[PDB]
């Protein structure tokens, strides 16, 4: 039994959210730094598998357990609308719409959760799809990030979407090299965030 990329299933939800938590702090574990790290998958993983599970893929460890993922959306403007209309009501009880400016790191992420319009960056308009990709530390440096990425790009291209972007923390230079090796170019660095993109054709 060997590790392999496969489509996400609903029984991968727990593992996907945990991978997200464990990589959300500029690639590193968010648990030491946040009171409720569940806000991360609530903003950056769960809505994708809720709304567009057909674009979610996992790295299976060979024993059935997801140990990495790639997920995303075919169309960012539609995703933002759907996120507000369909997703936010499902999490607003647990994470209420903010009434005052963020006081804590936790409240900063809740602010992002409640502003999916953050995704409407003018410079990425020509790259309609976007993604998040993460692997648990023990699974990095094994070629599996590439396997995930190529699977996701093929899925987008098959759906007729020609271009994709992503965001990354600018200071995270190892991530920058990872994306560079996967054929991404710099779109813009507006903020601690860099946007990268490429065409989805192989
Ligand atoms: Cl990052």
Residue numbers in the entry: 56 to 245, 248 to 259
From the paper:
The mammalian O-GlcNAc hydrolysing enzyme O-GlcNAcase (OGA) is a multi-domain protein with glycoside hydrolase activity in the N-terminus and with a C-terminal domain that has low sequence similarity to known acetyltransferases, prompting speculation, albeit controversial, that the C-terminal domain may function as a histone acetyltransferase (HAT). Here, a bacterial homologue of the human OGA C-terminal domain, an acetyltransferase protein (accession No. ZP_05014886) from Streptomyces sviceus (SsAT), was cloned and its crystal structure was solved to high resolution. The structure reveals a conserved protein core that has considerable structural homology to the acetyl-CoA (AcCoA) binding site of GCN5-related acetyltransferases (GNATs). An acceptor-binding cavity was identified, indicating that the physiological substrate of SsAT may be a small molecule.
The acetyltransferase (accession No. ZP_05014886) from Streptomyces sviceus (SsAT), which shares ∼27% sequence identity with the C-terminal domain of hOGA, was cloned and the structure was determined at 1.5 Å resolution using an Hg derivative for phasing. The SsAT protein crystallized in space group P3221, with unit-cell parameters a = b = 75.9, c = 76.5 Å, α = β = 90, γ = 120°, and diffracted to 1.5 Å resolution. A single mercury ion, which was bound to the only cysteine in SsAT, was sufficient for phasing. Electron density was observed for most of the residues, with the exception of the N-­terminal His tag and the first 30 amino acids in the sequence of SsAT, reflecting degradation of SsAT over the course of storage and subsequent crystallization. Nevertheless, the splay between β4 and β5 in SsAT creates a characteristically V-shaped opening, which is known to be the binding site of AcCoA in other GNATs. The observed maximum opening between the strands is approximately 14 Å, with an opening angle of roughly 27°. In contrast to the classical histone acetyltransferases, such as RimI and tGCN5, with a largely solvent-exposed complementary surface groove, SsAT has a more occluded tunnel-like structure restricted mainly by the 55-residue insertion. Interestingly, in the SsAT structure a piece of continuous density was present in this pocket which seems to extend further into the binding groove of SsAT. However, this density could not be attributed to any molecule derived from the buffer used during purification and crystallization. In the context of the comparison of SsAT with hOGA that inspired this work, the divergence away from the classical CoA-binding P-loop and the absence of a putative base, together with the potentially less exposed core structure owing to the 55-­amino-acid insertion, support the observations that the hOGA C-terminal domain is not, by itself, an acetyl-CoA-dependent histone acetyltransferase.
